[PDB]
Design goal:
This is part of a larger assembly, with chains A, B and C.
Chain A: H1 26-39, H2 43-60, H3 63-77, H4 83-91
Helix pairs in contact in A: 1-3, 2-4
Chain B: H1 4-32, H2 38-75, H3 79-82, H4 89-96
Chain C: H1 4-14, H2 21-42
The chains are: A mainly alpha, B mainly alpha, C mainly alpha.
Subunit structure (chain C): Component of the THO complex, which is composed of HPR1, MFT1, THO2 and THP2. Together with SUB2, TEX1 and YRA1, THO forms the transcription/export (TREX) complex. THO associates with DNA and RNA in vitro.
Protein name (chain C): THO complex subunit MFT1
Subcellular location (chain C): Nucleus
């Protein structure tokens, strides 16, 4: 009698819009994502997108994801700073 | 985030948005735990607010690390480096001698 | 026996230890509410 604890409202899994589609078509989709990331300018905006992707990723959880993070970080080493690593370090 | 002072300012702006979200979440929580209909609308507003608080927090911790890095990068600059550009060495040497 | 890489790895962790008590406290307040509100959306509820 502390509370009804009955919840009429509900939400379905239509999220992961930027990490969209099945994980199937894995390598094509993964290369597409890496290319899209390398494409973006205005580093700030990049950070924003990253957040979404990363939280979407932690919705699923694996070795494929680790390889994807390897590719992302290695692509980011070309530049000076390391944003992907810091953002994983927080969003973990 | 180029300077220690500028990064601290960005962190302050990130604190404020989190605070407003937290205060709104708390009031909705009070309405839900208050001794239906109003409680039903609140029980949905609470997930609506949730799709916001974690994202805002995310940003606060990110900036905390950002600020820590800049402070360390600034602290590496020793006194000699700053006085490289003094316009007139001469007078300095005469005065010291 | 510890390699050059491992020694550099402990040195970097030491060079950054920060103990800002004001900050850790605010994040803890945010968490003590995110865990409760997140639980209510799940509907687990329960009397603590």
């Amino acid at each position: 009698a502390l509370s009804q604890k009955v919840i009429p409202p509900a939400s379905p899994s239509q999220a992961s819009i930027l990490t969209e589609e099945v994980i199937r078509n894995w390598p094509e989709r993964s290369k597409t994502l890496c290319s899209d990331f390398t494409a973006l300018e205005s580093n700030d905006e990049k950070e924003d997108w990253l957040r979404t992707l990363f939280i979407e990723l932690f919705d699923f959880i694996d070795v494929a994801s680790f390889t994807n993070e390897l590719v992302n970080h290695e692509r980011q080493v070309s530049q000076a700073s390391i944003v992907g690593k810091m953002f994983i370090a927080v969003s973990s | 985030g180029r300077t220690y002072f500028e990064s601290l300012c960005e962190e302050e702006q990130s604190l404020q948005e989190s605070q407003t979200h937290l205060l709104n979440i708390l009031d909705i929580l009070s309405v839900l735990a208050d001794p239906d209909d109003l409680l039903t609308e609140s029980l949905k507003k609470l997930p609506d607010l949730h799709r916001e608080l974690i994202n805002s927090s995310i940003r606060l911790r990110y900036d905390k690390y950002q600020t820590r890095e800049a402070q360390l990068l600034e602290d590496t600059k020793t006194g000699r480096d700053v006085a490289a550009g003094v316009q007139n060495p001469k007078s300095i040497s005469e005065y010291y001698s | 026996p510890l390699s050059q890489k491992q020694i550099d790895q402990v040195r970097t962790k030491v060079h950054y230890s920060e103990v800002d008590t004001p900050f850790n406290k605010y994040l803890d307040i945010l968490g003590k509410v995110t865990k409760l509100t997140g639980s209510i959306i799940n509907g687990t509820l329960s009397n603590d």
